[PDB]
């Protein structure tokens, strides 16, 4: 609808945490459209122009002593401080996965099918999902969507297995996740239903 | 590699005169400031019990960003942003069973500028009832992502779509979903 040209300023103040808070890196990043033009990186300790467009800003701001000391304190005053405030419901947050198993194509036996394992609602992102046929793990024929972020502090993943079920067979999906102290296991037995 | 990242992300966009202030923990939103209401808005209501944020401080930042934008626009010889059209994916919150409450999720990815018209369609007709959306979320490549949500009761009779407009697309983009039987 609107074909008027557009103009965008972004600013990202980023705190990167390694080994709890025992190493923190603070980045103050300025963007024009998508182009980073100037940044302060606590590891460098002054502003550096990323693109020629940022030189006037790097040079002006680096001439301001109070400004630099202030950016140099940001690892503590800003990053550690905010890590403190949010830690309890972010870093510590754990929601259990829900596991559901089903065939994708309602087919007869001795015919190719995808058994779907749907893992849903979990936090944080890290998870592992294993398929077994009888008691034997199968890493062959595993087709996965990967980690999908739902945008609401939960993730899902869908892990499918390529089978040809014959009816004397049992298949199992095993899930591990930090919220759990033991795997959640879900079975599917090969028959008409 | 790093355990966690907290990003305070701001923008201002002309000539729309529109801006965002938000916090982000590992790619999920803690909160944002509704520039209209001048209020902090927690992504989950529970976060607000544990923390607080002086929203007036966000609006000041935005004013600095607006004023800077004017400067940057000149400095670039009035070079505008190149549209990057979005990718859209629709998926369910949990697996689909008939008559069992569920939520359709519209994941809108890898676009800029942060202006989109989104509409859930049920059988080609819009639906506002019970729906929700995030603000525009930052990406490491400096594009944006966004989610919309529609509660629904699955059915053999219904079809659904996520209709996304954006200046980088020639036409509206529909992403389709229907009960799978």
């Amino acid at each position: 609808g609107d074909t008027r040209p557009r103009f965008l300023e972004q600013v990202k103040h980023e705190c990167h945490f390694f080994n709890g808070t025992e190493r923190v890196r603070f980045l103050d990043r300025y963007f024009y459209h998508q182009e980073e033009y100037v940044r302060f990186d606590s590891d460098v300790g002054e502003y550096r122009a990323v693109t020629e467009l940022g030189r006037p800003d790097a040079e002006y701001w680096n001439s301001q002593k109070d400004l630099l000391e202030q950016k140099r304190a940001a690892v503590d005053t800003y990053c550690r401080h905010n890590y403190g405030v949010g830690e309890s419901f972010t870093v510590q947050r754990r929601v259990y996965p829900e596991v559901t198993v089903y065939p994708a194509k309602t087919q007869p036996l001795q015919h190719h099918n995808l058994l779907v394992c749907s893992v849903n609602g979990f936090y944080p992102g890290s998870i592992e999902v294993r398929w077994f046929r009888n008691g034997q793990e199968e890493k062959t024929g595993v087709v996965s969507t990967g980690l999908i972020q739902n945008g609401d502090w939960t993730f899902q993943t869908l892990v499918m297995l390529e089978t040809v079920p014959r009816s004397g067979e049992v298949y199992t999906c095993q899930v591990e996740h930090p919220s759990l102290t033991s795997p959640l296991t879900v079975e599917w037995r090969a028959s008409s239903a | 590699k790093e355990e966690h990242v907290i990003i305070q992300a701001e923008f201002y966009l002309n000539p729309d005169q529109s801006g965002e202030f938000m916090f982000d923990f590992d790619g999920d939103e803690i909160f944002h400031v509704d520039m209209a209401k001048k209020e902090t808005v927690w992504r989950l209501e529970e976060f607000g019990r544990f923390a607080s944020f002086e929203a007036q401080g966000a609006l000041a930042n935005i004013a600095v960003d607006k004023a800077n934008l004017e400067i940057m626009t000149k400095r670039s010889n009035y070079t505008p942003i190149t549209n990057v059209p979005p990718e859209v994916t629709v998926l369910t919150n949990s697996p689909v069973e008939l008559r069992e409450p569920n939520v359709l999720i519209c994941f809108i990815d890898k676009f800029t500028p942060p202006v989109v018209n989104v509409t859930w369609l049920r059988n080609g007709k819009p639906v506002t009832t019970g729906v929700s959306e995030t603000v525009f979320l930052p990406r490491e490549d400096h594009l944006f992502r966004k989610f919309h949500y529609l509660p629904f009761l699955p059915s053999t009779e219904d079809v659904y779509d996520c209709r996304v407009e954006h200046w980088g697309l020639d036409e509206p983009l529909l992403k389709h979903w229907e009960f799978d039987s």
Binding site: - | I30, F50, E54, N68
Partner: peptide, 14 residues
């Protein structure tokens, strides 16, 4: 028990 998030501030350009 109830903590306050601090905003980092952008600098005015030249």
């Amino acid at each position: 028990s109830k903590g306050l998030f601090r905003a980092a501030v952008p600098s005015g350009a030249s």
